[PDB]
Amino acid sequence: PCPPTNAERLHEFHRAIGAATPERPTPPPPELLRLRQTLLDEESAEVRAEIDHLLARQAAGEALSAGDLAPLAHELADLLYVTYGALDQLGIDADAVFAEVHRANLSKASGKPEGWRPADVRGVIERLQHA
Amino acid sequence: PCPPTNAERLHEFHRAIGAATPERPTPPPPELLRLRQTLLDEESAEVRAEIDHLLARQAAGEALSAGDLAPLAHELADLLYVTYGALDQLGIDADAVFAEVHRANLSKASGPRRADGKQLKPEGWRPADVRGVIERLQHA
Numbered sequence: 474p475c476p477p478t479n480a481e482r483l484h485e486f487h488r489a490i491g492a493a494t495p496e497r498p499t500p501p502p503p504e505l506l507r508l509r510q511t512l513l514d515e516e517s518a519e520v521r522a523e524i525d526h527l528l529a530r531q532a533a534g535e536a537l538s539a540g541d542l543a544p545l546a547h548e549l550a551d552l553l554y555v556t557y558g559a560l561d562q563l564g565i566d567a568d569a570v571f572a573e574v575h576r577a578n579l580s581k582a583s584g585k586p587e588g589w590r591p592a593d594v595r596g597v598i599e600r601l602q603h604a
Numbered sequence: 605p606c607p608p609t610n611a612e613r614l615h616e617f618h619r620a621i622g623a624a625t626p627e628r629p630t631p632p633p634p635e636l637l638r639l640r641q642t643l644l645d646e647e648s649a650e651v652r653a654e655i656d657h658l659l660a661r662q663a664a665g666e667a668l669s670a671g672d673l674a675p676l677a678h679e680l681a682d683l684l685y686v687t688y689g690a691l692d693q694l695g696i697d698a699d700a701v702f703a704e705v706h707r708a709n710l711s712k713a714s715g716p717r718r719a720d721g722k723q724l725k726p727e728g729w730r731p732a733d734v735r736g737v738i739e740r741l742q743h744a
């Protein structure tokens with residue numbers, strides 16, 4: 474009926490490979506955070522490589538097609554994957570946090586407007602521990 | 605009637621700031637590539653800073669509560685925001701690309717693990733075909 478969100482996809486992935494994936498916000502052991510840092514560094518370095526390749530081809534006068542974006546699109550999705558993966562392994566619903574960051578950002582795009590409240594992610598962590 | 609995805613939220617944001625973005629994959633100018641990279645680096649460094657700080661408190665012997673995770677969760681959401689931001693400015697359906705990367709990643713389940721926990725690829729694993737997703741999106 475409705476496809477899963479990318480965050481729920483990460484929960485399915487971690488369940489399938491036997492990786493920790495708690496239901497509610499859970500303080501992690503150091504080994505988890507180190508790995509999440511390592512995955513983030515690997516995939517952001519691959520994103521950077523594809524942007525450089527595209528910049529170099531443009532500098533040599535190449536006319537990029539839509540097909541030429543496939544490697545960059547692949548790596549930006551890998552970055553999403555490891556970014557969602559960090560939140561999932563922390564037991565933190567990424568959609569709930571994103572929805573609050575988006576509400577703040579979108580709200581700030583009016584006028585910094587009157588009564589603008591920044592993102593309250595701590596309050597999101599609280600509401601997530603009671604559901 | 606399916607609720608909005610986070611990729612669809614970025615299209616709403618870019619529209620609301622009048623920088624509205626293409627609906628189909630669209631090669632970008634160089635300045636747009638360099639701008640997205642800057643935003644990636646800035647939020648990546650903010651995420652790296654929060655990870656280092658939680659690791660430093662744990663190393664120091666301090667016990668994290670769930671509420672201690674909010675600065676890191678916040679920066680991880682920011683990094684999603686500018687990563688989805690880049691795909692939207694390229695006219696590329698992030699959800700369509702992600703679904704194909706996800707399919708490829710589920711097939712890794714029988715493979716070994718690296719010492720640090722990273723899932724590695726089983727024998728005969730086949731990569732995602734994101735070129736196929738771009739071609740699909742481009743000819744919609």
Ligand SMILES: O=c1ccn([C@H]2C[C@H](O)[C@@H](COP(=O)(O)NP(=O)(O)OP(=O)(O)O)O2)c(=O)[nH]1
Binds near residue numbers: 558722724
């Ligand atoms: O433990 C893992 C392993 C992989 N992944 C996902 C993230 C990303 O979608 C992809 C990255 O895994 P690899 O680094 O093994 N493959 P990649 O496509 O990045 O090729 P390479 O790293 O060799 O350039 O698999 C996880 O989420 N957790």
Ligand SMILES: [Mg+2]
Binds near residue numbers: 516519
């Ligand atoms: Mg990799």
Ligand SMILES: [Mg+2]
Binds near residue numbers: 516519547548
């Ligand atoms: Mg990659």
Ligand SMILES: [Mg+2]
Binds near residue numbers: 647682
């Ligand atoms: Mg930030």
